[PDB]
Amino acid sequence: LIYTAGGYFRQSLSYLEAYNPSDGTWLRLADLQVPRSGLAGCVVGGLLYAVGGRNNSPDGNTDSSALDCYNPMTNQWSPCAPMSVPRNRIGVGVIDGHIYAVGGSHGCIHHNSVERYEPERDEWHLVAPMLTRRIGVGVAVLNRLLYAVGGFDGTNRLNSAECYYPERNEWRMITAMNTIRSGAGVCVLHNCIYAAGGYDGQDQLNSVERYDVETETWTFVAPMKHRRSALGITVHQGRIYVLGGYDGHTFLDSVECYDPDTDTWSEVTRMTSGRSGVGVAVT
Secondary structure, three states: OEEEEEEEEOEOOOEEEOOOOOOOOEEOOOOOOOOOOOEEEEEEOOOOEEEEEEEEOOEEEEEEOOOEEOOOOOOEEEOOOOOOOOOEOEEEEEEEOOEEEOEEEEEEEEEEEEEEEEEEOOOOEOOOOOOOOOOOEEEEEOEEEEEEEEOOOOOOOOOOOOEEEEEOOEEEEEEOOOOOOOOOEEEEEOOOOEEEEEEEEOOOOEEEEEEOOOOOOEEEEEEOOOOOOOOOEEEOOOOOEOOEEEEEEEEOOOEEEEEEOEEEEEEEEOOOOOOOOOEEOOO
8 A cells, every 4th residue: 555644735734545556545544643744754664654844733833853653553653762853855765674864954954964763772863964955855775775866955956966875874976867856756666766756946847867876877757747846756566656746836636657667657546635745655
């Protein structure tokens, strides 16, 4: 199942819903303890983690440092130790069963900091900061290296990308993307890093490009049907799924699915309600 947690439509949301690509169904599961948008999702050891984000409510607006864990076998959330700082519009990635929290903002602060969570000790520790301040940063892991792609540094949107080596604890710039993108969906499919959609400061984007480590090169592939910023993305059974987002006018409920063998996108479902800034993962 494809799980989507949180998101934003007029205010931050609590929804946890899970899509079955065979059945077509959406399952309504336990609500997040706190409504959150701009968060990220990931899965370690079969548990689904919701990381960071921001609570936009009619009574307040607070960024979140929270880490929360959902168990599909109990349908229950339980909190985890929090990160050192709140991180709205975060990106995350998993290496060696550890969760890396990358970038994001806290108020006017635009993080370049990065921290690592270890589930078996419920502890966060800070690691080497990025070369760049990145909010709305896409994150993906390839061959146990951690890539941070695009984003917004507070003044400029970015097409640059950099790569973190866990065992040297350092970051190194890599080839930049063709397109400037903040709030894109970034994931690994087979052995290439995909960057889809986002916002360049002028338009929401439908273009998709992918990075090959062997040629250290970004190449465009088929674009999505719907331009969208702040979309969710994940990989299920060899295919990329992008969920919702914002196209400059509406918060989308469209879910598009990319097949790499045909290099084609199709709309496969609609979410129960349109939203942007979700966390998405598969377990």
